[PDB]
């Protein structure tokens, strides 16, 4: 995954738990020979998994919980790190932003060539609900989507409820989320 993801995890932990805790995690992740993450450079996915795994152990929180927090953090973090305009061009409401999600990831995809973005499809079921279909080349990142959706809720002063209804882990084709919103 691109450096920006690892920078954000790093930033999230440093800001909440301090520089020492970050170093402890860094060490345990097996990444002490890396002084900084380069935001526009592609890293092996392993870097991210090892980071999250290491932080799970050092912080005493399950990985899935950290992925949720990371998901929430990302919406705010990107607006401050080069993507404020891009975010604003994706919409004025949550359902609109969700429709534009592939588009948004493609507009990053011009900048970042070796991107492997997820694919999202919205089936609207009412003016206050939708089904969100999530397909990915990667495993175990559905909890991250849950945090992203709450981030977006916060962004749009919109109350939101997200419940996963289908899991790859039980053998379903792809993850599906039921979403209700203000």
Q: Is 140 left (phi over 0), alpha (psi -120 to 50) or beta?
A: left
Instruction: Answer yes or no: are the C-beta atoms of 115 and 109 closer than 8 Å.
Output: yes
Whole-number Å distance between alpha carbons of 50 and 31: 9
Q: Any known ligand binding at 181?
A: no
74 annotated ligand binder: yes
Which of 17, 116, 155, 174: binder of ligand HEM (CB under 6 A)?
116
Tell me which residue of 128, 83, 135 sits closest to 104, measured CA to CA: 83
5 near ligand HEM, judged by CB under 6 A: yes
| 138 carries a ligand binding annotation | yes
Binding residues for ligand HEM, how many (CB under 6 A)?
25
Q: If DSSP codes are grouped into helix, strand and coil, which group holds residue 33? A: coil
Give the x/- contact pattern for ligand HEM in 49-88, rule: CB under 6 A: -----------------------------x----x--xx-
- Residue 105 annotated in ligand binding: yes
10 binds ligand HEM (CB under 6 A): no
Structure token pair of residue 108: 């990053």
CA–CA dist 106, 117 (Å, integer): 8
Q: DSSP secondary-structure letter at 2?
A: B
Q: Which residues bind ligand HEM (CB under 6 A)?
A: 1-2, 4-5, 78, 83, 86-87, 101, 104-105, 108, 112, 115-118, 136-138, 141, 144-145, 148, 152
Residues belonging to the binding site for heme b are 2, 74, 105, 116, 134, 136, 138
């Amino acid at each position: 995954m691109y450096g920006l993801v690892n920078k954000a995890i790093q930033d999230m932990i440093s800001k909440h738990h301090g520089e020492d805790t970050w170093e402890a995690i860094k060490q345990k992740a097996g990444l002490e020979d890396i002084d900084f993450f380069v935001g526009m450079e592609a890293y092996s996915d392993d870097v991210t998994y090892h980071l999250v795994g290491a932080a799970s152990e050092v912080l005493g929180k399950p990985a899935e919980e950290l992925l949720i927090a990371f998901g929430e953090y990302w919406v705010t973090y990107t607006s401050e790190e080069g993507y404020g305009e891009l975010l604003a061009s994706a919409g004025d409401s949550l359902p609109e932003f969700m429709e534009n999600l592939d588009n948004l990831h493609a507009r990053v995809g011009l900048s970042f060539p070796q991107l492997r973005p997820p694919a999202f499809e919205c089936q609207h079921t009412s003016s206050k609900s939708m089904e969100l279909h999530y397909q990915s080349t990667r495993c175990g990142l559905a909890p991250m989507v849950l945090g992203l959706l709450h981030g977006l809720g916060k962004r749009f002063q919109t109350k939101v409820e997200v419940t996963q209804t289908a899991f790859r882990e039980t053998g379903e084709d792809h993850d599906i989320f039921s979403i209700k919103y203000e």
